[PDB]
């Protein structure tokens, strides 16, 4: 189970400059709240690097992997955490009047959201889905 | 903020029969764990109907609206709750050997997940995203 928040903001620079800035992963710690800094750095998909992630006051060492790299449209990475917590950061660049639109999607798992007990929540809803699929099979 | 769980199960009936079963919304209470029954019923997109939703032991009266209706592939509805809680049910039908694959995606908001205080969690992460977008604007 993953919970996502997606927010977009407009910036008066070219989609070129915006992409070149967000694609500068070394500078990610300058402005992305949840990235405190790296602990490992080449760039493209499959690149694996360890960083420190600050979410919800919990700080956790995460192994990030670039899952998508589409210049100059968008870059997306997912990461694994110590407690099996899952993270996702998806930055998109679109054109707009006056410049660009930068969209950040933040994805957190249950454990990264609430601790090792948000897994209780995740398990409950996953079991609801499992039971629904079964009852469907058993009735048709 | 919305948290999603998506699980797929295989059923030995034709994609025809599977779609006709999941599209029978009156029978949704037969097998979908979170749908306890309706309180209102025509069918297609924009159709608005009130039902009772059981998620996480919390029972809440939800105004569901069919947001997507694609025979015989998939049907998707989102719903509003008393506390401003948000719900989403997305049932997809694909073909496979031996019959069909039925996929259920369940989407719950923070309040429907944890009560009026999961909104604290949602607000925290939404504010992280807002701050990140701002700091980006202020630095480029």
DSSP string, A67-107: EEEETTTEEEEEEE-TTS-EEEEEEEEEEETTEEEEEEEEE
* Distance (Å, whole) CA A41 – CA B128: 25
Residue in B133, B134, B135, B137 to test binding to A, most A beta-carbons within 10 Å: B133
Number of domains within chain B: 1
- Whose CA is closest to A91, among A54, A66, A109, A108? A66
Between chains, do A139 and B30 touch, taking CB under 8 Å as contact?
Answer: yes
Task: Give the residue numbers spanning the domain of B53.
Answer: 2-139
In the structure encoding, which two tokens stand for residue B74, read together?
């998939």
Helix (H), strand (E) at residue A70: strand A58-70
In the structure encoding, which two tokens stand for residue B28, read together?
């949704």
* Distance (Å, whole) CA A136 – CA B21: 9
In the structure encoding, which two tokens stand for residue B67, read together?
């947001």
Helix, strand, coil share of chain B (percent; to 5): 30, 45, 25
* Distance (Å, whole) CA A109 – CA B72: 32
In the structure encoding, which two tokens stand for residue A50, read together?
């360890």
Q: In A, residues 5-44, which contact B (CB 8 Å cutoff)?
A: 5-9, 11, 13, 17-18, 21-22, 30-34
Helix (H), strand (E) at residue B111: helix B110-114
Cis amide leading into B72 (omega within 30): yes
Experimental method reported for this structure: X-ray
In the structure encoding, which two tokens stand for residue A126, read together?
């996953």
Q: Which residues contact B101 (CB under 8 A, 6 or more apart)?
A: B8, B9, B10, B11, B92, B93, B94, B95
* Distance (Å, whole) CA A105 – CA A92: 8
Q: Are B106 and A129 in contact (CB under 8 A)?
A: yes
**Residue A114: strand pairing partners:** none
CATH of residue A80: 3.30.530.20
CA B109, B112, B114 angle in degrees (round to 5)? 100
* Distance (Å, whole) CA A20 – CA A23: 5
**Which residue in chain A has the smallest CA separation from B55?**
A125
Quick one: A14 exposed, middle or buried, by C-beta within 10 A (0-12, 13-18, 19+)?
middle
Q: Are A93 and A74 in contact (CB under 8 A)?
A: yes
């Amino acid at each position: 189970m993953m919970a996502s928040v997606e927010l977009s903001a407009d910036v008066p620079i070219s989609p070129q400059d915006t992409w070149d800035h967000v694609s500068e992963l070394s500078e990610l710690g300058e402005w992305l709240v949840i990235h405190e800094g790296w602990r490992s750095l080449p760039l493209g998909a499959g690149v694996q690097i360890v960083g420190v992630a600050r979410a919800m006051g919990m700080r956790n060492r995460v192994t990030w992997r670039v899952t998508k790299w589409d210049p100059p449209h968008e870059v997306a990475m997912t990461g694994s955490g110590k407690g099996g917590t899952k993270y996702g950061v998806t930055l998109t660049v679109r054109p707009t009047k006056g410049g660009s639109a930068l969209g950040l999607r933040l994805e957190l798992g249950g454990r990264a959201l609430f601790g090792p007990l948000g897994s209780a929540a995740a398990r409950a809803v996953k079991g609801d889905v499992e039971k629904s699929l079964k009852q469907f099979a058993e009735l048709y």
